[PDB]
Design a protein around this ligand. Structure first.
Ligand SMILES: [Zn+2]
Length: 311
């Protein structure tokens, strides 16, 4: 018979007794050993004393320690996340002039878009401990845990292509700002009245629907639920950075504007670019250009310090 150590956090361990009659999965459950899923194998003596990472059939304790480490997750999360880690350890990172980019493999071009964007976002951190720990590992130079994690939270699938902007939302939905940020929208209807809509922190740094600063600070017009001519305009905006993102939009980018970076969608393919002339990163292969015809999807602007007296 066999006794091994079972953990879900690499901190808390319990001993489980195993025979070598049936498989790990049948006796115990989904178990990973040194990255490998060995649920459907026979317990060997050489696997004795060593530590396993359990993925299902958790105790009430382990379940609680899971929800504190990863937040509230579905019963298939841990297996999916562990599986993804094994799937993506083969992936490689290119480093061109102290800039890290994700080499192309298994249609992971969108993950190159997400991560190269996130590496520019200043003063962000994640509330979920495991994600924040992975994030600090990623900036440290080891990105396997992080890449795997956001694929897990994003319900992605290995190999399958995916919407980069959808993912950059899910990830940012779990982050927060380590500083001050303010965004005030001012609506008004003559029968209904003036109304100020306020956003603080991260939500004040990211908008979906418009691709540039200009179309953002513009006066919208529509119909109030009151039943008349309603208006809308951004009157206050203070950020360390601004992330605007919309559907793929064809245009010519010239280099001197004030973007800092942006993503492009070709076709099912993503590219990330910066402005230090235009530098582009097509998943490892770096290029320099002075102008580009492309379908921009997300744009990154520097810190906003803007006020409008609204006339
Ligand atoms: Zn009204």
């Amino acid at each position: 018979t066999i006794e091994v150590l079972v953990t879900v956090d690499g901190v808390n361990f319990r001993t489980v007794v195993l025979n070598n009659k049936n498989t790990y999965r049948s006796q115990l459950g989904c178990v990973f050993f040194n990255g490998a899923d060995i649920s459907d194998t026979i317990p060997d003596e050489k696997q004795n004393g060593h530590s396993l990472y359990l993925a299902d059939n958790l105790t009430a304790d382990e379940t609680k320690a899971l929800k504190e480490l990863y937040g509230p997750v579905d019963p298939t999360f841990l297996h999916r996340f562990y599986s993804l880690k094994a799937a993506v350890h083969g992936w490689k990172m290119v480093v061109c002039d102290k800039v890290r980019s994700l080499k192309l493999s298994d249609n992971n071009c969108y993950l190159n878009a997400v991560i190269m964007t996130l590496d520019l976002l200043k003063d962000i951190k994640f509330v979920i401990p495991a994600l924040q720990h992975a994030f600090m590992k990623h900036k440290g130079g080891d990105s396997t845990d992080f890449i795997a994690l956001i694929m897990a939270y994003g319900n992605c699938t290995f190999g399958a292509p995916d919407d980069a902007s959808r993912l950059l939302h899910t990830v940012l939905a779990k982050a927060e700002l380590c500083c001050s940020a303010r965004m005030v929208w001012r609506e008004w209807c003559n029968v209904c009245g003036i109304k100020d809509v306020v956003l603080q922190g991260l939500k004040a740094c990211c908008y979906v629907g418009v691709q540039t600063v200009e179309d953002l600070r513009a006066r919208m017009t529509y119909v109030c639920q009151c039943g008349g001519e309603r208006h809308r305009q951004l009157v206050e905006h203070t950020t360390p950075w601004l992330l605007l993102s919309g559907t793929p939009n064809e245009k010519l980018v010239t280099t001197a504007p004030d973007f800092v970076a942006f993503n492009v969608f070709q076709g099912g393919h993503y590219v990330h670019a910066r402005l230090k002339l235009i530098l582009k990163f097509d998943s490892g292969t770096v290029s320099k250009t002075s102008d580009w015809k492309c379908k921009v999807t997300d744009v990154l602007f520097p810190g906003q310090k803007y006020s409008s007296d609204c006339n």
